Design a protein around this motif. Sequence first.
Motif, PDB file in Angstrom:
ATOM      1  N   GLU A   1      12.736  -6.216   8.121  1.00 43.56           N
ATOM      2  CA  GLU A   1      12.025  -5.184   8.849  1.00 43.56           C
ATOM      3  C   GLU A   1      10.969  -5.780   9.779  1.00 43.56           C
ATOM      4  O   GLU A   1      10.618  -6.956   9.663  1.00 43.56           O
ATOM      5  CB  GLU A   1      11.435  -4.167   7.881  1.00 43.56           C
TER       6      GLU A   1
ATOM      7  N   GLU B   1      11.064   0.959   4.408  1.00 43.82           N
ATOM      8  CA  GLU B   1      10.581   2.074   3.613  1.00 43.82           C
ATOM      9  C   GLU B   1      11.002   3.410   4.246  1.00 43.82           C
ATOM     10  O   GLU B   1      10.873   4.442   3.628  1.00 43.82           O
ATOM     11  CB  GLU B   1       9.064   2.009   3.450  1.00 43.82           C
TER      12      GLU B   1
ATOM     13  N   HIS C   1       2.634  -2.494   3.519  1.00 46.86           N
ATOM     14  CA  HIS C   1       1.918  -1.394   2.896  1.00 46.86           C
ATOM     15  C   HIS C   1       0.775  -1.908   2.060  1.00 46.86           C
ATOM     16  O   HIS C   1       0.968  -2.770   1.187  1.00 46.86           O
ATOM     17  CB  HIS C   1       2.803  -0.564   1.995  1.00 46.86           C
TER      18      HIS C   1
ATOM     19  N   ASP D   1       5.872  -1.748  -1.094  1.00 47.65           N
ATOM     20  CA  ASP D   1       6.629  -2.946  -0.781  1.00 47.65           C
ATOM     21  C   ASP D   1       7.319  -3.504  -2.016  1.00 47.65           C
ATOM     22  O   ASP D   1       7.071  -3.067  -3.134  1.00 47.65           O
ATOM     23  CB  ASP D   1       5.715  -4.014  -0.203  1.00 47.65           C
TER      24      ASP D   1
HETATM   25 CA   LIG Z   1       7.521  -3.367   3.457  1.00 48.00          CA
END
Ligand SMILES: [Ca+2]
Length: 213
Positions: free
Chosen positions: A11, A69, A104, A136
């Motif tokens: 990500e 997420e 996060h 996470d």
């Molecule tokens: Ca993450």
Amino acid sequence: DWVVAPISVPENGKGPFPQRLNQLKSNKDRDTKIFYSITGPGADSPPEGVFAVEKETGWLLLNKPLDREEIAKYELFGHAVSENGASVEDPMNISIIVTDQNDHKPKFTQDTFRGSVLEGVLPGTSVMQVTATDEDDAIYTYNGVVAYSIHSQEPKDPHDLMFTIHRSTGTISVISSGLDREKVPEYTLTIQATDMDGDGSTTTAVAVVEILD
Ligand SMILES: [Ca+2]
Ligand SMILES: [Ca+2]
Ligand SMILES: [Ca+2]
């Protein structure tokens, strides 16, 4: 057999975008011109247009950074059609696995946690257990692993640092003697939770400790 092995993409990629991921190729392109296309959630249905395929070349492209997420895994299908309009392959299952970054902060489950003890409890007595979560990964990495600590104590009578917190469990304990309800009937602790087991970023909450009568 028109197939592609699962692809793993972290990500929050920096790009540049569009980013090539893999080249889809039918070997029937020696017989004719092939036009490639992709379907599935992330391609032709919501969220649309995260992924695309170049019509002539078959390069699979990622158009923007992924967010684990939001969606952690995609299942797309590749298609190969001849110039005369015939599909020439069975649609290709394309698996994309989005891997984690630590993006996060931890979150305490409550803004205020409360607990109480008798005035005569000995040092080492557990008062309360607080909790923070982190969205996470905490299986393969520390991105989601929280370390607890005390930020500060009020009032500071009979002294400061009268409490501690278990770094992994969030259990707050009394570590000093000298509790006395008549003098100080309640302590307000500011507590912290930090990810990467202490090396990352930090959030706070309050724990109020009442000295019982
Ligand atoms: Ca993450
Ligand atoms: Ca994310
Ligand atoms: Ca985190």
